[PDB]
Symmetry: C4
Subunit: 469 residues, 4 copies
């Protein structure tokens, strides 16, 4: 009660700011959960996180410790074992009454913390039967046996909790988290091998070590419980990895049928793990694969029409100088974003260089921020004539990179670079072009067509009337 | 004839309601099949289903029982065998005359049950030659041998029936049916191993057990027919799983060539099964993989233009708060649906909150149900200015979730939440905005633009005339 | 010269009609090739086909026969061998002068047969150097050795010819041709195993059988050339399939390094074959996989908005009753076809039922064949109100299947089926609907909207003027 | 200083012309780097390339030589070893001061060479800590040990340099570079096997060869360092390839745990390499796979509507005569190109045949070069009526290939081929067509619709006014 209540709120500094955005919303959420019910626990809290971590580190320890103690220890020595059982049972029993006061995430953004009445109404018909049935520690003797067998369904519980924490933590991978995921799956396969090896030692022990089993043939009848277990894990690992039998082929019928069961189960589990890990690795470089497919389609197109190899080389260069080996499309990406995001990106890219035009300075910021929505991004190669003489002028350009040489008859050479705006005369009248610019380097330009500018100027009458004046 | 005729109709309570929709159509279909022909059987019936199940459980039993009796039983004891043969032959013969009176599914919705004349006209040139040829029980002696060999083509028959029932049952998978499909394929591979093991015992038996074969080397010459068969299945399973030879490498030429045939066939069959099962598992989470690819393309786009890490973090959050880790698109989905479905979904999402606007109450339901077709669904983040001062008003918003704080100069703070409609003034006149709202939580809004509302109001003149008045 | 000239033309009855379309074009092509040059051979002929088949069946026989005769026959007995060599050499030499008079397929439709001058101009700088260099049968002695080694580059020649015939034969697979392709690749892998096994017998023979090799350990020193070769193929097959060593692990350094080379090469070749065969099998059911992905996206969409389970069940049924478990899109398919194809398909689907409208009979066929371009195909479920009272009429419908019950106040029930056109009154005036039809079965309808009909009637003034009158 | 300064510039004749385009830009870039800083080195130079190649060929030699000298040489004979160490250390130390004067590629096109101040500002917080820490040659003794261990992090350095050179060299694959990539990955896996085999000899050597290890069992205790190493590589290769244990199963606990570690690591590494190589091979024929999927969707569409087999055969032919077995789309490809590229391709395809029209000769080149943007490419089959009598004329055609027979009532037969323009009369007036042409071969036509021509003629008033006159 001293420091305990403060751990009930969503206090994660890094996790909750990522999930809620603003600290005012985080403080507000804590106040709402505190003021709402009798005394409730939030599922974005530090306390729920450490409690779930303790439950996972208990269940993994049970899954390791149980099948070694079933078959390997000749002397039961129940005392320490029964103490271990009771601690796990009281942890599940403390948890059973804890999972009735926690908010349930109906949606990722906001969850409901109204009262335990709603929470129990979902929790009952959601999982209460299997959780309570596994949670408790000749009909009565049969129930004792059934209760022992039923408590095995707890495993499923960890699966739900892992999946909840994993998804709310990390859902779009990078290289490092993919490596962590692969190491987790290799640990799970090793756990399956551990259970399998204990079973393959257990079954010849229940028949009291006949002469056909592998324990009697290998002279490992009486030896240290570490050596027997290690050899059993080896045999189960070799059946999984399909590198062979442990030492000799099965010679008794119990060993033959156990080996066939272990072979089928282990080989199917391994070769279905590795396909998942291969898809997990190959899902990192998806953009480069999309670029290669697009280039293959372009290559087929050039082969269909029999272009000369000069044109094909130019097309190959142009693509390598635009997508840069990775495929994307700004159009759909800027159409999927909301309005302040698409405002900020367009503003950051083009605001500084578009404010340098002296016709753009004194205008209202609404006018220029509506003009910012019509800029097209283009790439020109060395030697391409952007403008040619006698052509009707239709769009203007702003340099974003590169150098551009202007060719005039009188003035024999003129250079522009570092973001230079040209072809500006086409915005105020219609007629033939008077010069011709040529790219000298791979120049990225931002284009503004006259049709789009005309529509914007029509939309703001005061701007258009000022232009008339 | 007592209860028999009622089983001829499509009486499945769960299956036929799924297939036909309305019970009036189910009763009508049964009446039509009953009244149409002489005496016909429907292929959506209970009777056809149990008959096909009995045929499958007979053919699987034949496929298991035949190659054990060919090679393993030293004493033929034909009597019980010949009785078993005759029961299978009369089942195929009862079936041969049954498959002339069943409706044929030309299409999934409705099938034709007009007369046996049409059914025989398809059935003859469709499968009657192979079905009748397998269906019957020195030229005459050669025919006896050919008839024995030909009856083997019946296997194909089960393939057609399984495929028909499987497809008309379940065609879009979940996790559980995928697990059932994988267990079925493992059973088929085990069947192939069973045939292979019986063959590998049969071929050294026909040469009367020479000293080079594996039966004579392993001292399994005279032993129980269970031990020999089990070891043979083991050897065939080890050749399939490629974990090694059964015990020692082949030492005779018959064993060498049999082992090479079994190796090639088994390894190709296994490694072509496992690729199918991997694709079957990976086809469950397709939406999450589509989301990861879209995010990778977005990441490449942010790297191409060198945005600051603040903007990149906002873009990462915005996507995690919109698609929720799974990729979809409402546009094409609502364009692929028919008219009452797309009516019902739009009505359920927006009808309750759009009826709260006091301008929407007294209007005709045609007007509001045509207004319901222009609502766009948007997501705004904490801190994003939805409206800013001095901006021309162009769309209104209805809260579907979250809180929104209105900022006014005089009234220092105003809150809206639980589905609150604001920016309503822009529908009735054009001019600068007078306040500025700011999101406080991740708010889902439904937007209605003035252009769409203007088009609707033009379409209903009486509504527009009422607005004028 | 008697029957010989007639085999020079493209005489394939099945292949050339598939490739050229019309028999007049086939006769014309033969006349053009006959009349064009001195005396030329067409590469769509029967003669070129049988000649290429003979060349392939010679080169495969050489690839099998050579490495058995290099290492297995103790007595060279050159005589028959040298005769075999000379027949293969004169076949390549007859072919060298034959590949100067055959037309070259610059494009699949029409090839050039103008003169040998153009053909030699491509053939020289295309492949003449490697073909002629492999085609011929101390510097002179070194050349004899180099000529022996160079003639090995002929293998490549078969690769070009196989690829040409395979592609011009079959390029879009079915199940059977996929099975043929897989059997071909298994034959190629068996060929590689054959060469590998002969090498693994050759290398311990060149050292004159030391005590560490597998031939001396297994006591196969002097034995029949069939037994040695069979065991060598077995060892190479076990190294490829990775099922183990042939019998014992390598004990000499020559065997160790040979086994490591054979292991790496064989395992990489096998596991790169099987991925190709898995992709080849999985490329048959692509439409069903596209349907499953679309359904998964739809399921995510229904989960995002929390619809009741009634609506979700209706959406699940509607999709299963429209795409029928396989995904396609008529739009892009009918936009990719040329004009007589898209004319024929639309005409076959809708001409018979659209001619039954008595307003459509007496009109010009241009008018109705332009009306045929505006029909939309829809599917309605049991219980969906197609029309409701008081709604403004906007489109008419033609039944293509199913029954539809019309509900009127006076006339209590009216049925339509077998292709019945209703809602026809909306084409001639605007106003509220007067009845309401309801689907009783899963009915496929063809819809015609008033906007499209109005545009067509405007396009034909005489039709529109007749309607006015 | 004599020839040394000239190697500092981007002097690659083949690489730098590919990267910069024009030789004037290459000369200009060299002048800019020379004139800019104190004395700097460009990362597109010959010198940087040879220096990085020398560094890679040193680090690979270190990775091979180190773990043979750790465990295999009984006599240390430090002298030559310590000399080898010092040469590698002084190479890393010469490099440490060299990587402070090289330009850093912020973008692929142009990099910054302004001053070492910016370069050090990126290089410090980018990699200077790990590079300098690995670059140098009881706390002091512990540091000596830590320095030995830390210098192992240099490996990473080669990974960055390889990735930079690989990407700036080759990014879209062909067959040959894919084969080179696969051979590189097999070399990397062999390197891992080399380290693994040295470890499996090292661990039984540190325990001074007990009787359970494989070295003592196989009698390889004292033998040549080539035989021991070769057998160790064999055992590591067999654990990777999962073909079995080297000779006998592990019999001591050290061997058992080493074999389990080596099994898991090697099998996971191999089966994750082979999936990458399979995806790398299958990414070459992507266009043919896209064509097969499109054809499967078309086949489903023909099966949904029950067309006769004549129509299906025509659809199958038409597709095989248009995409030619490989899938592409000109639309998006010509929409992704910049303006001079899309000018050049359209001009090369259609300029020569469109200039033959005598109405197109005397016009201004702007008019025809704007007409060139409206040509649609179509394919017609034998027997398809392109025009039929009594139909309103709407588009004209230019032959690009094939023969076309014109049918007239008076003139009984008229042929056109070799690029013949017909239907020209529809451009100057509206009315019924007067003849009907029929394709005789698979003819590729270029179509020009009247609507597009009318829009162009409206755009150029002088052309339209001339047509009026």
């Amino acid at each position: 009660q001293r420091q305990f209540g403060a751990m009930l709120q969503p206090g994660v500094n890094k996790f909750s700011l990522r999930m809620f955005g603003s600290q005012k919303a985080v403080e507000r959420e804590q106040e709402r959960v505190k003021s709402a019910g009798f005394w409730i626990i939030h599922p974005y809290s530090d306390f729920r996180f450490y409690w779930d971590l303790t439950m996972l580190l208990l269940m993994v320890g049970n899954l390791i410790i149980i099948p070694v103690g079933i078959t390997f220890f000749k002397d039961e020595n129940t005392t320490p074992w029964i103490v271990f059982n009771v601690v796990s049972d009281t942890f599940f029993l403390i948890d059973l009454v804890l999972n009735f006061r926690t908010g349930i995430v109906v949606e990722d953004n906001t969850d409901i913390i109204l009262d335990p009445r709603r929470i129990k109404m979902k929790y009952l018909k959601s999982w209460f039967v299997v959780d309570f049935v596994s949670s408790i520690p000749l009909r009565i003797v049969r129930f004792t046996k059934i209760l022992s067998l039923l408590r095995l369904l707890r495993l499923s519980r960890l699966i739900r909790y892992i999946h909840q924490w994993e998804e709310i933590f990390h859902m779009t991978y990078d290289l490092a988290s993919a490596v962590v995921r692969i190491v987790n799956l290799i640990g799970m396969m090793l756990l399956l091998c551990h259970w399998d090896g204990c079973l393959q030692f257990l079954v010849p022990m229940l028949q009291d070590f006949p002469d056909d089993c592998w324990v009697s043939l290998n002279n490992m009848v009486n030896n240290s419980w570490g050596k027997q277990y290690s050899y059993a894990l080896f045999k189960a690992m070799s059946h999984m990895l399909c590198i062979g039998y442990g030492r000799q082929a099965p010679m008794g019928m119990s060993d033959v049928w156990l080996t066939m069961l272990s072979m089928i189960v282990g080989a199917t589990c391994y070769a279905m793990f590795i396909g998942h890990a291969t898809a997990l690795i190959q899902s990192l470089d998806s953009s480069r694969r999309q670029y290669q497919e697009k280039y293959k389609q372009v290559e087929q197109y050039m082969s269909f029409h029999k272009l000369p190899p000069d044109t094909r080389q130019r097309i190959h260069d142009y693509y390598e100088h635009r997508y840069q080996g990775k495929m994307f499309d700004e159009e759909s990406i800027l159409g999927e974003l909301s309005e302040p995001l698409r405002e900020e990106i367009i503003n950051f890219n083009c605001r500084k260089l578009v404010a340098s035009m002296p016709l753009f300075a004194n205008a209202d910021p609404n006018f220029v921020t509506s003009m910012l929505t019509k800029l097209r991004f283009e790439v020109f190669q060395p030697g391409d004539y952007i403008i040619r003489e006698g052509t009707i002028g239709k769009k203007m350009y702003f340099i974003q990179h590169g150098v551009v040489s202007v060719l005039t008859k009188g003035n024999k050479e003129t250079k522009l670079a570092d973001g230079s705006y040209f072809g500006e005369i086409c915005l105020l009248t219609r007629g033939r072009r008077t010069a011709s610019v040529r790219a000298d380097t791979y120049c990225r330009l931002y284009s503004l067509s006259v049709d789009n500018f005309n529509e914007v100027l029509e939309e703001y009458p005061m701007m258009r009337r000022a232009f008339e004046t």
